[PDB]
Design a protein around this ligand. Structure first.
Ligand SMILES: [Fe+2]
Ligand SMILES: [Zn+2]
Lengths: 581, 308, 21, 434
């Protein structure tokens, strides 16, 4: 019974990457078969340093090594897994190093505090003090998991070691330290956070490398979430103000991208005093990316403002900046604004929305960019309950008409998908009065994808508006295409009947579309004929058994005698599926 | 039984629809059965209206999917391709495999003609041989496909009024019976009527001429008009020449060139087109643009995430 | 009337004839 | 006063008509100086290592691999050359060594590592390879690593391809240990060292209408210290310094370094000899050096209207520009490099001559890289070139110069006085006299 285990063990030396990978992923079976002491003394030394350096093999090995706590002899001997993971935490591949660090953190919880101070802490010190910055980068991620469960002297040593990493010469080590600064500070005492974490945060935030400075914004958020509100101004606020006006556009982009988190962390008073001018300057930034990032946060930032003076601030400070953003030259800035500007109506109120937001909506609805118009249309639900869609339909209809007849068929496809929501919001009467012709004209479009999308949209519309409206308006119109000289439109009629059978009910299907389907079985084009066969197969369950045995079965039988092979095959398949014969 | 193979062929088709190559045994069986089907296929195959005529694809699988989106999916839409399914494309193998699978499954619905670029000599130079070698590690699949390429029909006739072929007319060819008399079950020759039918081009110069491609002849409006009057052909479809607007009329609406590869060679930035023939032989062209794909490494002027 | 750099003319000519058939 | 240069080593074939595959096309020291990599037109990178016993050891072969293979552009029916254009070392991450090698179209990241142990042991097959009895497997055995003779393995880790329309001419690694740039004739792309499926195009000077091209990008380089500053030179003799902090796209330049052209030297070839073939930042980062066909110009980064120092590499060829135009010798792309302390600069010339200019003392020395003095620890005799006639004693006449012997690629040891000079086929290494 040991033969498969012997095969797996010898597969670790195989030159084939796939076989060696498969053997790696079954290391649990090998360890279980070998035992415990044999696993510790034979398998682990072999897996300590592997000559093969394939990224996926090393990644799989790193994943497996984090679950061998029981297979090596329980938590008592968990320190035996340290060498293989320490070797993996040094390789050049970033994902392998991250997986090794994650496994080390996962198995660190099984260490007793004595084992933590005897084996894990020396490992962290060796990694932090190593000659290769790949080791030092990995060491930054292991401070938070061993700090809470050590003595005071070990805590001071760990703090000193982390302080040394933040002043490293290699930019990657400093980047890792900046990344892990917040999660490290989350476990220190508040006094030590003020005394030691703040100087490191200030030093990293004023680093020469732009890639290091932009990582201080997340650290800023994490540190602000810890300190008391009265201590924010003296410690965190100057760094945040410096970051908001930083020379590099990447740092300003990071500030704008995490602006709502900063607003939540610092509180309402600091938000009103300092963050509002920062947002005003960010929306007027000279970089298009920064303006686009700040545009996304307009709605949330306005929502989270203090209710004491929310409307006044929005009117006197944010609204002019928004007005300047509507006329922006960058397409992406306008696209980003259009998707969030539409929801400021509930905050401002009906009269304020009519006076101020309505001109902005009208101006953005006439933009040359299709995506701006699509974004404005897609979010009408925010204002639908504030001012009503009656005040908006007169300007929405021209925009919908323009989008529905765009030269690019993908724009027409995009506007189609929003029609059921638009029809639901605008009401059935307005749809029948204005939008019915647009929907019908899509079924005869040259592009087949548009016809398919219009068919699915018609199914959604009938689902929304019920069967009676469909039978009254659409069904008499869709069956008119059966007389189209082009066979593509006839097959479109078949497809529309296919999707409408599931919703229109058995009675309507039998009385209105079944006679049309049966009449088209005599179409000269074989494509229409076997499409009729497939349609009869599909809508077969909806029809009654009496109708199936009376009129459907003879029609299917006649199709089985057709000259075309495809028609015969599809008719036979329909007969087999319906079990008529 | 035929039914189990029918479901097998179907599953092959859906597998290919998402750009997934078939196994060597599957390719062997597909090529053998396509050869069996194409053995009885005539040199001038009669194509019955309605049908959609497509031009060069040249291995652009995603553009082929865009073509299917624009014009409809087989077997709902009858198609008629005019050669050049491989070469100068990242997915020549997938494209030709999907086309052959569709031909085997729907022999009455899809008709595939023969162009210049599906031959042992051409495919060794323009990357199809290299593509199959890099994706399979052996020339067996190349041998299967090149053996199958010999059986593809040279020309097609649509209701006896529209003549569809890859290259164009030949000095040695005057009647459809001449094409029917040829032996197409061979490698593409360097000369002769068979070579001209896959290498000729239209030109404004009267009479005949020499072709700078290295083979074939260039024919003028007089030759096309004489051929149309002799064979009673209202129109002569064509392909094999890149055009920016997708379809191009020439020789006073006697020869039309159709190109179905948008952004030819990923650099030309051209439009593609397909000719749709109504039930009443009413021609209508549908131009389309390259499918939106991120692409092999996407060089963008938008700041990527790693720099953001 | 100084002559142009070879790389300029090579790039110009190579990109000009990108529709050869 | 001057540095005494002595012949140390020569690498390559001896007195043969080498084919167009052993011609060295790039020479580059690594950051610590103990590794020296050379690429040739055959796509074959050879790495030398200094012996361990100032460090005045010799260089011996350390690794050899085929970087780029010949390839065919099926999209345009052109052969893609496998010639190695540039080689750039990465800072040492771990025991392994990394470098970037580029041909005209593709940049490859190569890892050089040493393997000195081999797994020995099996459970179903003897060490020779014979298959053992399947019923003799009673106890499982785990393979155990065993020491072996050290071997050096080079493998490609990442491929950055299909992103440049034109021929790549420069690669430079950023100082943030994260990104690097590759510049073709008209565009500059910013890459990530661990991401190959996308690149960021920061500079694009290609006009919409291309029948009015006037210049192309000939070189590019990041600042040695600053992570946001890089420069790129054009064929018109202008260097543009771009700041990546101002905007995401660097289509507008922060500074423009150019010297107004006096109509005195307004010859027919004044546009060719003014093209910049190489731009190099000083190690301190406060100075920038550019090399055109006839001169070396050192630019102060705070002064844009004129260079601070100008050195004439070979003035005697100014009057013979017409002759050099006929045999395509006027289109050569020479290079230049700084020394460790940014005090001496060395650049190549014709007839196996390489020139060295001392910035502190304003002194010039011309030396010959020749096999005629193939004796180690031999002081190189300075060379002097005279015009036609007046050959004095040791004067080399201009008409006797061999223009087929060009020293295009040179390198300096980052810390020591060791220079690598690459002739057409051989690689010469010279050392200071100690
Ligand atoms: Fe062709
Ligand atoms: Zn073609």
């Amino acid at each position: 019974s040991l033969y498969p285990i012997a095969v797996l063990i010898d597969e670790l030396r195989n030159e084939d990457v796939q076989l060696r990978l498969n053997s790696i992923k079954k290391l649990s079976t090998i360890a279980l078969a070998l035992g415990v002491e044999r696993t510790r003394s034979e398998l682990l030394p072999f897996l300590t340093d592997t000559i093969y350096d394939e990224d996926e093999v090393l990644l799989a090995l790193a994943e497996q090594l984090g679950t061998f706590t029981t297979l090596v002899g329980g938590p008592e001997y968990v320190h035996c897994l340290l060498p293989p993971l320490e070797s993996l935490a040094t390789v050049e591949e970033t994902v392998v190093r991250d997986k090794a660090v994650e496994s080390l953190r996962a198995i660190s919880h099984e260490h007793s505090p004595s084992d933590l101070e005897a084996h894990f802490v020396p490992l962290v010190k060796r990694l932090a003090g190593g000659d290769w910055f790949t080791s030092r980068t990995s060491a930054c991620g292991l401070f938070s998991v061993c700090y809470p469960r050590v003595s005071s002297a070990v805590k001071a040593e760990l703090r000193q070691y982390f302080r040394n990493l933040c002043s490293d010469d290699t930019p990657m080590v400093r980047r890792a330290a900046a990344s892990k600064l917040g999660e490290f500070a989350k476990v220190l005492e508040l006094d030590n956070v003020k005394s030691e974490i703040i100087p490191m945060f200030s030093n990293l935030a004023s680093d020469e490398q732009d890639s290091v400075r932009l990582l201080a914004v997340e650290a800023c958020v994490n540190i602000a979430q810890l300190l008391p509100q009265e201590d924010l101004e003296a410690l965190v606020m100057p760094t945040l103000r410096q970051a908001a006006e930083d020379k590099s556009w990447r740092v300003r982009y990071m500030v704008a991208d995490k602006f709502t988190e900063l607003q939540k962390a610092v509180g309402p008073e600091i938000t009103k005093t300092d963050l509002v001018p920062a947002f005003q300057n960010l929306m007027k930034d000279c970089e298009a990316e920064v303006r686009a990032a700040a545009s996304h946060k307009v709605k949330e930032f306005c929502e989270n403002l203090s209710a004491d003076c929310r409307e006044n601030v929005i009117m006197s400070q944010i609204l002019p900046c928004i007005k300047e953003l509507v006329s922006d030259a960058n397409q992406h800035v306008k696209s980003a604004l259009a998707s969030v500007i539409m929801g400021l109506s509930p905050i401002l109120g009906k009269d304020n929305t009519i006076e101020h937001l309505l001109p902005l909506f009208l101006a953005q609805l006439k933009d040359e960019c299709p995506e701006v118009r699509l974004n404005i249309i897609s979010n009408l639900d925010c204002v639908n309950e504030v001012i009503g869609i009656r005040q908006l339909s007169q300007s929405l209809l021209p925009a919908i008409v323009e989008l529905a007849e765009d030269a690019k068929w993908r724009v027409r496809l995009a506007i189609i998908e929003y029609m059921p929501l638009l029809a639901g919001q605008l009401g059935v009467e307005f749809f029948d009065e204005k939008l019915n012709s647009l929907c019908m004209a899509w079924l005869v479009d040259h592009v087949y994808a548009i016809r398919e999308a219009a068919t699915s949209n018609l199914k959604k519309l009938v689902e929304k508006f019920g069967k009676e409206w469909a039978h009254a308006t659409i069904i008499p119109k869709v069956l008119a295409m059966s007389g189209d000289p082009n066979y593509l439109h006839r097959m479109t009629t078949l497809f529309c009947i296919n999707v409408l059978s599931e919703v229109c009910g058995q009675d309507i299907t039998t009385k209105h579309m079944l006679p049309t389907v049966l009449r088209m079985a005599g179409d000269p084009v074989a494509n229409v004929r076997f499409n009729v066969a497939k349609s009869l197969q599909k809508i077969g369950p909806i029809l009654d058994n009496s109708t199936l045995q009376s009129e459907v079965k003879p029609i299917l039988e006649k199709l089985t005698q057709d000259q075309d092979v495809d028609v015969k095959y599809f008719a036979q398949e329909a007969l087999t599926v319906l079990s008529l014969a | 039984d035929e039914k189990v193979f029918t479901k097998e062929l179907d599953q092959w088709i859906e597998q290919l629809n998402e750009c997934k190559q078939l196994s060597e045994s599957q390719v062997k069986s597909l090529c053998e059965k396509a050869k069996e089907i194409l053995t009885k296929e005539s040199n001038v195959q009669e194509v019955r209206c309605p049908v959609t005529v497509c031009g060069d694809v040249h291995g652009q699988f995603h553009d082929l999917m865009e073509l299917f989106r624009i014009g409809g999916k087989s077997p709902d839409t009858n198609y008629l391709f005019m050669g050049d399914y491989v070469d100068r494309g990242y997915y020549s193998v997938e494209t030709v495999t999907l086309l052959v699978a569709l031909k085997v499954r729907y022999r009455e619905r899809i008709t595939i003609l023969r162009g210049n670029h599906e031959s042992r000599q051409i495919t060794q130079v323009y990357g199809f041989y290299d593509e199959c070698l890099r994706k399979y590690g052996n020339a067996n699949v190349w041998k299967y496909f090149t053996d199958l390429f010999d059986y593809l029909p040279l020309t097609a006739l649509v209701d006896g009024q529209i003549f569809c072929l890859h290259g164009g007319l030949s000095p040695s060819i005057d009647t459809l019976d001449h094409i029917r008399a040829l032996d197409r079950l061979q490698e593409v020759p360097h000369e002769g009527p068979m070579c001209d039918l896959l290498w000729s081009d239209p030109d404004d110069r009267g009479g005949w001429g020499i072709s700078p491609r290295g083979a074939g002849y260039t024919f003028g409006q007089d030759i096309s008009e004489t051929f149309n009057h002799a064979n009673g052909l209202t129109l002569v479809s064509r392909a094999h020449q890149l055009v920016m607007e997708g379809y191009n009329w020439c020789h006073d609406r006697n020869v039309v060139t159709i190109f179905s590869a948008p952004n030819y060679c990923y650099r030309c930035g051209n439009q593609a087109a397909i000719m749709e023939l109504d039930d009443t032989l009413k021609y209508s062209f549908l131009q389309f643009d390259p499918a939106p794909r991120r692409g092999e490494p996407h060089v963008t002027r938008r700041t990527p995430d790693y720099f953001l | 009337s100084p002559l142009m750099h070879p790389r300029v003319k090579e790039v110009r000519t190579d990109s000009g004839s990108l529709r050869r058939d | 006063n001057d540095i005494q240069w002595c012949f140390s080593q020569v690498k390559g074939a001896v007195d043969d008509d080498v084919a167009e595959a052993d011609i060295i096309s790039t020479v580059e020291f690594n950051h610590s100086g103990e590794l020296l990599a050379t690429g040739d037109k055959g796509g074959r990178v050879v790495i030398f290592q200094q012996e361990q016993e100032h460090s005045r050891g010799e260089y011996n072969v350390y690794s050899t691999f085929q970087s780029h293979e010949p390839e065919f552009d099926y999209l345009k029916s052109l052969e893609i050359e496998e010639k190695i254009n540039k080689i750039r070392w990465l800072p040492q991450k771990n025991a392994a060594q990394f470098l970037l090698s580029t041909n005209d179209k593709t940049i490859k990241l190569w890892k050089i590592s040493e393997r000195d142990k081999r797994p020995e042991g099996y459970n179903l097959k003897e060490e020779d390879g014979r298959y053992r009895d399947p019923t003799t497997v009673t106890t499982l055995r785990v393979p155990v690593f065993r020491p072996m003779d050290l071997m050096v393995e080079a493998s490609p880790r990442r491929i950055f391809a299909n992103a440049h329309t034109y021929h790549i001419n420069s690669i430079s690694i950023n100082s943030d240990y994260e990104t690097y740039l590759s510049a073709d004739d008209l565009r500059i792309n910013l890459w990530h060292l661990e991401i190959t499926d996308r690149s960021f195009n920061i500079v694009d000077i290609k006009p919409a209408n291309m029948e009015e091209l006037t210049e192309v990008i000939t070189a590019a380089e990041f600042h040695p210290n600053s992570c946001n500053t890089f420069v790129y030179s054009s064929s018109k003799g202008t260097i543009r310094l771009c700041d990546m902090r101002a905007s995401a796209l660097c289509d507008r330049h922060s500074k423009l370094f150019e010297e107004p052209e006096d109509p005195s030297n307004r010859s027919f070839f004044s546009e060719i000899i003014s093209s910049i073939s190489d731009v190099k930042f000083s190690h301190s980062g406060r100075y920038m050096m550019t090399r055109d066909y006839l001169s070396v110009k050192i630019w102060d980064l705070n002064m844009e209207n004129r260079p601070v120092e100008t050195y004439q590499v070979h003035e005697y060829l100014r009057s013979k520009l017409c002759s050099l135009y006929e045999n395509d010798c006027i289109f050569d792309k020479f290079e230049c490099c700084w020394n460790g302390s940014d005090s001496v600069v060395m650049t190549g010339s014709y007839n196996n001559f390489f020139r060295m200019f001392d910035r502190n003392t304003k002194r010039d020395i011309t030396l010959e890289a020749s096999r005629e003095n193939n004796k180690p620890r031999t002081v190189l005799k300075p060379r002097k070139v005279c015009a036609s006639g007046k050959r004095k004693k040791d004067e080399i006449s201009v008409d006797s110069l061999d223009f087929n012997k060009k020293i295009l690629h040179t390198a300096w040891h980052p810390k020591e006085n060791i220079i690598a000079v690459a002739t057409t086929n051989n690689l010469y290494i010279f050392q200071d006299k100690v």
